Write a protein that binds this DNA or RNA. Sequence first.
RNA 1: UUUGCUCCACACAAUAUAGAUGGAUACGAAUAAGGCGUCCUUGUGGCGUCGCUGAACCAUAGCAGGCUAGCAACGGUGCACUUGGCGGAAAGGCCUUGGGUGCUUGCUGGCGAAUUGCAAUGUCAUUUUGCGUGGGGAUAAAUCAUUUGUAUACGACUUAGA
RNA 2: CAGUCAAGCGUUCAUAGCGACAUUGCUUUUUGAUUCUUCGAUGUCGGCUCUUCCUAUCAUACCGAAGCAGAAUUCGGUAAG
RNA 3: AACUGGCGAUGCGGGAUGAACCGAACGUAGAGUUAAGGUGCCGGAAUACACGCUCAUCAGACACCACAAAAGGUGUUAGUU
Lengths: 191, 197, 106, 97, 171, 136
Amino acid sequence: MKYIQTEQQIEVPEGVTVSIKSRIVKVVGPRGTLTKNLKHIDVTFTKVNNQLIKVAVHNGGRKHVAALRTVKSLVDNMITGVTKGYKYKMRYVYAHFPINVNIVEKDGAKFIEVRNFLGDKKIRNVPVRDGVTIEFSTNVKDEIVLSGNSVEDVSQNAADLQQICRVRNKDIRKFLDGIYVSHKGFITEDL
Amino acid sequence: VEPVVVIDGKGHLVGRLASVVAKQLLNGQKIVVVRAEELNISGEFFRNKLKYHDFLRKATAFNKTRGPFHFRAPSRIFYKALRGMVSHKTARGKAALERLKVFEGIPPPYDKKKRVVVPQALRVLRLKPGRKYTTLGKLSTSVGWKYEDVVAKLEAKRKVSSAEYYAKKRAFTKKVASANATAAESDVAKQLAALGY
Amino acid sequence: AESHRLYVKGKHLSYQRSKRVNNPNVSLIKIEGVATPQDAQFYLGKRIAYVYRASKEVRGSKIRVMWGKVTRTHGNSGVVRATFRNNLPAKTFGASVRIFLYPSNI
Amino acid sequence: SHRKYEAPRHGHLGFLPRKRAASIRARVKAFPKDDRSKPVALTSFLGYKAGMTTIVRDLDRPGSKFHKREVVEAVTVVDTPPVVVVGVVGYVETPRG
Amino acid sequence: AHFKEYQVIGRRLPTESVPEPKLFRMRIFASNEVIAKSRYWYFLQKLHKVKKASGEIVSINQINEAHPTKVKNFGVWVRYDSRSGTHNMYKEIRDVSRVAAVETLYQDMAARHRARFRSIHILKVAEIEKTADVKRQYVKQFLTKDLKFPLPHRVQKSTKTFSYKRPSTFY
Amino acid sequence: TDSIVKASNWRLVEVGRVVLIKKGQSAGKLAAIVEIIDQKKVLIDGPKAGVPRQAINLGQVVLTPLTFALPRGARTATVSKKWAAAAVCEKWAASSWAKKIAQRERRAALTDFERFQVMVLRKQKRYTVKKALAKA
RNA sequence: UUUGCUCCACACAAUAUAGAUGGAUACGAAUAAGGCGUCCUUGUGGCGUCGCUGAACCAUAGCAGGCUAGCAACGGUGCACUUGGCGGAAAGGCCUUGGGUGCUUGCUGGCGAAUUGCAAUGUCAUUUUGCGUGGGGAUAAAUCAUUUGUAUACGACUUAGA
RNA sequence: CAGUCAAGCGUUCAUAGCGACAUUGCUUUUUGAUUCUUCGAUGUCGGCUCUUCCUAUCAUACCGAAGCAGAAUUCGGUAAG
RNA sequence: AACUGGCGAUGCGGGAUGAACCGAACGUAGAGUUAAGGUGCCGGAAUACACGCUCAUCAGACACCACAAAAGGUGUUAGUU
């Protein structure tokens, strides 16, 4: 109905700086720097006192005022990744064949290797996005940790593992085999 | 008005530009259209790819070599739209289509000349903000055009040379201003300002 | 110095026509620089010449002229109607005509 | 009405027109994709088909029932005297090829 | 075209049994006097037992807006016929005059319900100048205290077909 | 280090915003946005510049950088008093946009003799400017 | 085989100009953003200003532009030459290095123009050549006929033959 | 040939798979109804041969869903390569 | 088979095309104005002005007319307690 002015406030912690050109957001902080293009959103920005930034849409429809809060949340995600980071913990579910996971380097690219998923001779290879760190967490059997700044790449790597571990030609209600994300949290939580 | 008008095809909606250019060519204006790979079409890229596949499906059944010739280059796509907007089977239409020339990128005759725009065809002015659009080069390479990368390389080289030329022209203009500021604000300049120049 | 032009440039667009029939007795002329009927009203009654060249000499010149006059305006976009002592040869759709400044009223 | 019984088409429509070639010598339409890292090398040679003959060789595929057993195979002999390099041509890439 | 508002007063034709009938009045938004009288007779035929032949029109007057250059809020009660039934709707708008208010109400009805002029009855146009009486959010939105907004992406119209510098949409 | 954002502020429409009407009876006169009817309509007043108090589409008017304090919906006399107090007319005349408009009017106003004079003076200034280029 | 074939001009001589009558006047880019100028922290910013159309900019005064005299000025500019190049997307365009020559309306003078008669486009720019003239250049192949058989209905096609 | 609603079937359970009583439809591969073209003639049934097209998909590719434990099935999607 | 108007027997402008629809009926010409229909280009004529709605991985696009339905959808827009 063309809401005349819809604006949201993105809060900026005391340690991070947001440099925003036309629509190129760059958040810098203790952990690193994250860059996002927003040229497809058609939104406007106005910094208040270096601790808040107002993101506004003038004369927008329903589908525009939705995207406004969407980009506010995306900037939330970038700031949160640059401050605390994202940690995705995924467990291995297997009935008979134990999943064998490794980290290999063909031409130095840190692929994740999955073997014996339901005991097949195929090895499932999945690359790791830049800035995503893989850790085989101890003190718990069959757990893998995906850590990073960009929640998009961390969650997409977790999704890549989960998708490459699909069961075919079987009833997936019984064959519960696969690597499933069991935890979505922060690297520096409770610090 | 001019011997040849050269149009920067970048940012131009293909249909609006084709209509403008067809009217001009019939009116008797020579037109060269450059940067055809940067022409726009309103609507999603998948949509215009489906439209081009619908075009591709049409061909003379008993001999595909007699059928519609589905040209793939962005310049040829623009030319097909314009030939549809011109009465091309008459001698007048043939003369207009002879007056037209269209290229990908900017060839050597025209990278050294002035290029204009048609604001009633420009996407930034015509399309509503938030509307999806496609680029003719992207659609063309999706449907079989083989020179997206050669054109991009030559375009980068040409833009580099043109930016160097622009830097030199800025320097010359600035030095002219610095040297002739001393001769500025003179009595002749004051008389011209009073007269309106 | 290098400019001797004492006329305004124009294009012969087409004959007066409907969708499917034309009238060669009236020609449509676009006057360069003119884009409104209000501005084209200046050129009403002004003489026009279609100047062309032939390969054969007639009366000491290889250049022939067909004279005419701006009779009224045509449409909302500065095109005018013109009438020539001989209808324009229809191969000149988009050819240059000279709209002179006489008979002058300024 | 439909074809009563389905059969495949007779011939391959991608080898058309089944016309005479423009010359005896069949030019290479496409050469292997270039890579700058490998050393400079030709990618073709010109020979004359002389005839066919037969060879006997031990066949080595680990899993066939003729593994490590001799096989009789037809071969084609191409007589290839060394070709003389007389000239070179350079092709600039253009938006027309 | 431009709607005007007419006060149309008409009565039944006086008979000897009943001289001076009740002489009813309406307010009619119409293009001209002829359509104003026609709509008056339409609505009178809808309410009471009288038609143009059986009655007469004693007065028609243009009602000009009291202050045609002030901004006020208008509540318009309308009744309209869809393709399936008859519905009463209430809409709130902002204009300087009642006639332009009804004009843009007709435009709005045509645009949002495909309701033509024939299938619309303007039940009432009431002017409200006090807020918290306005109920529509698309009017409360411009009823904001110290309201100010920009106009991004200015598109400038060019009389010449060709431009020699790339356009700017700054405003 | 501080965070930077491009301010991106562009000519709000608001009460007191001075506009330059571009088409119509006025077509080149200054008015003040007295009230906002809608996203596309505002009530403007031009008592000094000759614009009657009227409702208008923003498409007809062009927002100018000038603004003066003015109560919302103020009458023509009050708009007039505040316009005089803020001295917006001379501020507009001082701008290069209004200077451009006046310059274009003057150029359209010249005669043939004045065009010849402009030619003569421009030839003189060009000679002296290119001489300064050679000597500098 | 009378002067051949190949790179410019002329007393001269085509279908004719899909149509000059001062200039087709060169930055990427974005448009919910930029252009220009400046400043300071080896830093992707600050500051000022502009736009709101090319109605601009450049060129433009002289017999379709004649013949001539001066003034501070070494400029601007058309041409036979010479020096760096740069440009391959369809490069066929841009300055300069220097010598020669002509105009200069940058500021001031002297002579001429009629009669085309009151207007008549009132004639000013181009994929070709020739008994012709001169600044210079080398004297080739195809085809038929014969042959061939890696081809072939016939033509064509791989071949050979002083 | 395909939908809509679901009284019921499916040990419970309308809609995994079905689905009554009703009802809305889709090119004409049926057959009618009609008689517009052709009676100074458009050669007729089927088969053989061969090309192409449609998709309302039998198989094959990849998926969703089951009253899918596995195998085998069944219901659907993109799909006529 | 109905009071009728047309085609046949009739051109013309519009409906792209069409016996019948819309406009309008016809001597040979010239000016002006129109009807029906239109004005992005084809194509003569506003890429007019104004308010909305709509984004379709089969959009829609103007009567006769060259087709779509029931049933659905926090797609989006506007409307009672």
